[PDB]
Amino acid sequence: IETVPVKLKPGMDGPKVKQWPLTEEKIKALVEICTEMEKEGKISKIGPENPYNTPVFAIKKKDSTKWRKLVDFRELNKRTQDFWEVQLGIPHPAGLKKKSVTVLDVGDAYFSVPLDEDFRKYTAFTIPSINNETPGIRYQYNVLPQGWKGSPAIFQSSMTKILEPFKKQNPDIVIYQYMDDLYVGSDLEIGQHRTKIEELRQHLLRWGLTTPGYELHPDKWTVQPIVLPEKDSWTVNDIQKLVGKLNWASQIYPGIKVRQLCKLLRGTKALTEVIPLTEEAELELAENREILKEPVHGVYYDPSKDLIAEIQKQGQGQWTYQIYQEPFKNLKTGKYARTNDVKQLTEAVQKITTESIVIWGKTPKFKLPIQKETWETWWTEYWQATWIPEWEFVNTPPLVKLWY
Amino acid sequence: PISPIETVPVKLKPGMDGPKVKQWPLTEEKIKALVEICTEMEKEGKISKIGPENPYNTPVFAIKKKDSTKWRKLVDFRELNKRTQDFWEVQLGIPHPAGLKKKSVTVLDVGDAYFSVPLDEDFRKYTAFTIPSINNETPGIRYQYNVLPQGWKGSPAIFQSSMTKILEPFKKQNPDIVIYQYMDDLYVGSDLEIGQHRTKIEELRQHLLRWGLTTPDKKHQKEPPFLWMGYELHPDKWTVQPIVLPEKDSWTVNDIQKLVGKLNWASQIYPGIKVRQLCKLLRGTKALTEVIPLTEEAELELAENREILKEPVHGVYYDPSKDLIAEIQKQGQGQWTYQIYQEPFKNLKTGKYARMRGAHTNDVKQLTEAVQKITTESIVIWGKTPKFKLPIQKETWETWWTEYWQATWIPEWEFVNTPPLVKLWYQLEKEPIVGAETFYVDGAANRETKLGKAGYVTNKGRQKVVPLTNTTNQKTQLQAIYLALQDSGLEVNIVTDSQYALGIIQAQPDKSESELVNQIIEQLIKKEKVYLAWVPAHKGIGGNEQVDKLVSAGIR
């Protein structure tokens, strides 16, 4: 077909990111995946006249054994935003976040559309070699690539033709496309939903597009409150911490009255000294916590601002997080629990990212509590998504205290 | 020759046009030179004549070559270059000898490489220079290039790209002949016999000949040793080139540096190399010729290093069918060394880690840092992460990782008792210390003065308030905790309101850059039970309120 002319954000230039070192098997795995993408003519070898580079990795399928190529187009996406967002934007359904949602990988569907011959140089990538004993294999895309948010946008046309029949015959089933994935949601019963899915897989199949699984239940995604203890005992130590956390709960969740519980059994007593109880207190613990159960009044999602995900390590496979646009203005807090610390953190990121895509339709930027070099060395060892969120590394302060 | 090989198309940065630098007049002897030289090249095909219908001109010079027998032709391309397109780097890494597979190795060197390769036609017109005529009279001979000019941006890029495409077939034919191409040279090795090897070599030279690429005859230079990139490679082993310690009277900064440099370079295969004492001496903007008297430790360190180098030590080559074991040893303070091997003690490569990583850090953290570093290095060199052998207890490690705020991993590892063992030098209780004073430390200070009173107050009436001079509002909160530890028992409950103070201590630091913080540590290592709590600073809570009063009142 005719290629959709693509252009970069004027003033900006193609990606020039280095290829992070890979382990033997991921190399061998890729030189095989790319050697076949060459037969099929989806990518072509390139010359030194290409000054560009975008990194790539090999991850494992849905826990199977067939490696997948994962190109990190995180940069080129930015250099292309104007294109994939305003020009050919893809609408997000507010209904999706409301009994079941299946995620289907309509990815292979892009390698069928040519890519503007004038844009292919911007998708160059390199397959490194151990110990640098060899130049290093270079390539570029001739067809729409998979990590590139640009792909969905161009393919957003053909896609509609495919789904159309299925949509016209199921006016109540929601379909959302998001960079490589198709999100199908319905209020039906598991059996009726699950069936309707297969039904869709067949429509897809007729356009040369096989499918998988993986079911999310959005209507049961709930907020993670900021808990307040409730022990029968009570030490000066305990009550102090209680007034410590309640303090925090004020720079957010406006209305948290801590006046009564404060100045409580004060003076200069030993931390141990067990203490009584008050009636203003009994009422303040409850009066406040009740405010802590509900969402922050005054906070609303802002389509123009970035979403941020902050994750704290709670200990014992416990991880707590928060999604917000303006510090301490939580659009949502949550949890994640149940081997390696890195193995769990990446797990949580994807869960969170997935939830973010369903609700706001965009991935958040993670402020990750780990050492940069460590993350980079292993994230791709447990990663299974086809997208890669933005991420900065932070040093979690003595705030793990409160669950937020 | 001029390899038939296709040419790499190239062009100038988009919003730009060729160079047009005027040709400054050269002396008569120089003009003769360039004429004897160019005329020569032209007969070779490396350059061709062009007329005044070529608005592109790049300066030309000549300088006496080796001892001045023959002249050389320097074509200051700086202009063409700043306008040429950016290319893909020639190398983004170097083979580490330790990652090379261990019979026959010889090195062929491409004669006139850059010149034995064609240049994209549509671009030739830009590499047009000119030979002046005895004081700018006659016009001059105009010339352009048909092969890769020397000092040009894309000559290394395009030469390599080609030399690679030319080897592809031969390599495919002999997947048993490892071929590494470093610039103008080609390192070729195999597990054949000196006879069957040289046979292949020829076949290669021939294959190369069929592509305009000329190569040595009996001057193969093969004969390992192989002095390459600082190393001395042999077919069976490797090592750093000869390191020789000057051993002189007085040392200048310039001297201490070159030394630190050989030593760092030696530490790749030589275990034990220490440079902490020597580096110290290089602190503070010091003249490059300034002599520096050696301290005790330095004088000694140079000794131990001198010792480690008296006898040659060689590394061994990598074997894919075996694992990699890496053992890390804690040398002195904040100093770590490690060895990587496959066969017990036949080191593949050595190394040392000393990075600081801010102030406030403890051995477990550092060891995790050294493990990370070594891992990265092993993925690049050997394509896989080694199995570690650490001088830390699985207990000390698990106890430290499961409580820390930061996420931490660490590849398969085993213990190995090689003292000094690693350990946490003190813990912080989770639940208060019943029957044990409760110091409420606090601090403050005037900002447009830098004066503050640090102090505390207990549940036993005690209350001290020592004044400070030139302290930040923080030190006065971190100094109040140092007090609470002095005039305190072997078990104490300190209550601070300095997130800043609570942060530093909470992360069991066992060494620091803050002298106070180091003091606050000795204490902690001496107490027998400490508990740290925080409460809203200056918010007015029973306790902090009271100390806050005699602390802030006056001098605030």
Ligand SMILES: O=C1Nc2ccc(Cl)cc2[C@@](C#CC2CC2)(C(F)(F)F)O1
């Ligand atoms: O894999 C090997 N083995 C090897 C063993 C001994 C010597 Cl000296 C040289 C090599 C070799 C190389 C190289 C250049 C970077 C130094 C060769 F490619 F074979 F030349 O790389």
